[PDB]
Structure 1
Amino acid sequence: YEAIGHRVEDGVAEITIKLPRHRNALSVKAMQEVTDALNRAEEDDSVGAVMITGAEDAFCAGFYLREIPLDKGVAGVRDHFRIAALWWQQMIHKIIRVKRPVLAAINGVAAGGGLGISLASDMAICADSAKFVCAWHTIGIGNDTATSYSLARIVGMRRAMELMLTNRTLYPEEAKDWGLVSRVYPKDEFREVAWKVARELAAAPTHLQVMAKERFHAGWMQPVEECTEFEIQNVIASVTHPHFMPCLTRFLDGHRADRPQVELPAGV
């Protein structure tokens, strides 16, 4: 890849937003590469989870404003946004639809599209040095990157509306209180903690994960009876899968099902 950092180890496909000089804003090319990378992860039997993080001390500053053409008129501007907006779309959608759990490791500021990415991921943790901001209004653009889908689904309509309208910066503590992030860790221990959490996610049963993830997205909008129908189909498939019997055996042999799949350290 030439615009993103990418590495697969320990069952984790790690995608790094890398444009640190410009606060990890996402270029059109980079977005194409993240999506490709998400496609490849889903196709890799050796990948159990995906982790998205930023290079250095920023997560992602959102739209790459420095690539917008300024010498071609409104047209040039409209044209650029049609293309970049399509890639923000492709990528955000892939994060939500990919058949792998995605951990957003928020190591610094997440603005605009950056916040969009954080909201689209399955799990999210951040460094105590991280921060979140809508930023759309500041730059005079209508909000996107599925913020009309994700934000309210996580924080409720009221907080979603306030954050977008006030445009204020949300800090770790509050982000955690809001459900935006599950846990916060000292900056210095952040990377290590996050990689370990990703390895666990990767080691846990992908099949079950995917069933949970797809159902969560779909179920939000379905009535109970349709929900159960789809869940039951998953149940039947899961107990037919070779993974099951051995777990039952263990349970019957005294091993408790409250054993965690992923251990999230307390953090701060």
Structure 2
Amino acid sequence: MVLKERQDGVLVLTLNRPEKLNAITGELLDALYAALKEGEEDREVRALLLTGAGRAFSAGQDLTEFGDRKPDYEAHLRRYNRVVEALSGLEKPLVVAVNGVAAGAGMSLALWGDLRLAAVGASFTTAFVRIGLVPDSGLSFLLPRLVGLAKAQELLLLSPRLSAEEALALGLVHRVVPAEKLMEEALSLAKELAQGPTRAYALTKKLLLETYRLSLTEALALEAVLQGQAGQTQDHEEGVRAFREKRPPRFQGR
């Protein structure tokens, strides 16, 4: 369901239902959740890389999973939301490599990467509105923050099929590279992050995730609390030492 591979501190997760364009099912989500939990808890893992097998990243919800049964969407989203909670709370950087179609919840999941890359030919389609649904799996939370409300309105209400270049223009991805180079570039970035100050990355992500709903006073207090934690890490000491010694730091994520 989800392939797992480790390389130099990087846990590579590959959605694996290629014949179905990695369409999402409860089984896939449970496997993805288990993989994220393992990655989050494995001290050897300093970074994660998420991508899709085959021609697409993920076409979103597999409509065949419903069959002829009646919609029970509020409950059905339980598996999606726990995966989103896990992604949002990762205490390690996540790189996402969008290799092809990313639509619906597939797009929602792709956008949770801290650093995102798309291959030439990849596309982003909100898609939900096309079948009379609303954005889910955190897309209504992430999209406005990532591309601004003006573009979020257009993307969600009109559901255009965005090219990789258009995604780069809006901030949906940070880089666009030739299809045959996507994974090498993404993995190279993930390995660099895997050598970085993991706790700083983790705590920085927490600040960003909670910043919009906080007053400046509350934000300053949170920065104080989290900086206090970061300041006590062995990595911070190493960081200061390396700077003074005019040498590269050797971080260990603690």
Sort the TM-score into its range (normalised by shorter chain).
Answer: over 0.9
Partner of 1:119 in structure 2? Answer: 111
Instruction: Give the counterpart letter for 1:104 in structure 2.
Output: V
1:71-220 equivalences under 5 Å are 76-79=69-72, 81-220=73-212
| In 2: Cα distance, 1:171 partner to 1:147 partner | 18
Match of 1:68 among 66, 69, 80: 66
How far does the alpha carbon of each residue in 1:104-127 deviate from its partner, in whole angstroms, 9 at most, with x for none? 111111000011012222221110
Q: Name the SS of the counterpart of 1:129 in structure 2.
A: coil
4+ aligned runs moved over 3 Å, structure 1: 81-84, 254-257
| In 1: Cα distance, 2:75 partner to 2:96 partner | 25
Q: Is the 8 A contact 1:11 1:48 kept in 2?
A: yes
TM-score w.r.t. length of structure 2: 0.93
RMSD of the TM alignment (CA)?
1.6
Does residue 249 (structure 1) correspond to residue 247 (structure 2)? The answer is no
Q: Name the SS of the counterpart of 1:52 in structure 2.
A: strand
Q: Is the 8 A contact 2:89 2:206 kept in 1?
A: yes
Q: Name the SS of the counterpart of 1:78 in structure 2.
A: coil
TM-score w.r.t. length of structure 1: 0.88
Q: Is the 8 A contact 1:17 1:26 kept in 2?
A: no
Does residue 9 (structure 1) correspond to residue 7 (structure 2)? The answer is yes
| In 2: Cα distance, 1:243 partner to 1:131 partner | 38
With over 3 angstroms needed to count, the CA separation of the structure-2 counterparts of 1:213 and 1:85, relative to structure 1, is same
Identity level (%): 29
How far does the alpha carbon of each residue in 1:2-34 deviate from its partner, in whole angstroms, 9 at most, with x for none? x11112221111111111111111111010111
Q: Name the SS of the counterpart of 1:31 in structure 2.
A: helix
| In 1: Cα distance, 2:243 partner to 2:3 partner | 41
| In 1: Cα distance, 2:248 partner to 2:234 partner | 19
| In 2: Cα distance, 1:172 partner to 1:102 partner | 19
With over 3 angstroms needed to count, the CA separation of the structure-2 counterparts of 1:44 and 1:256, relative to structure 1, is closer
Following TM superposition, by how much is the alpha carbon of 1:243 offset from its aligned partner in structure 2, in angstroms?
A: 1.8
Q: Name the SS of the counterpart of 1:100 in structure 2.
A: coil
Q: Which runs of 5+ in 1 are unaligned?
A: 71-75, 258-268
Partner of 1:34 in structure 2? Answer: 32
Following TM superposition, by how much is the alpha carbon of 1:152 offset from its aligned partner in structure 2, in angstroms?
A: 0.2
Tell me how many residue pairs correspond in the alignment.
Answer: 249
Q: Which runs of 5+ in 2 are unaligned?
A: 250-254
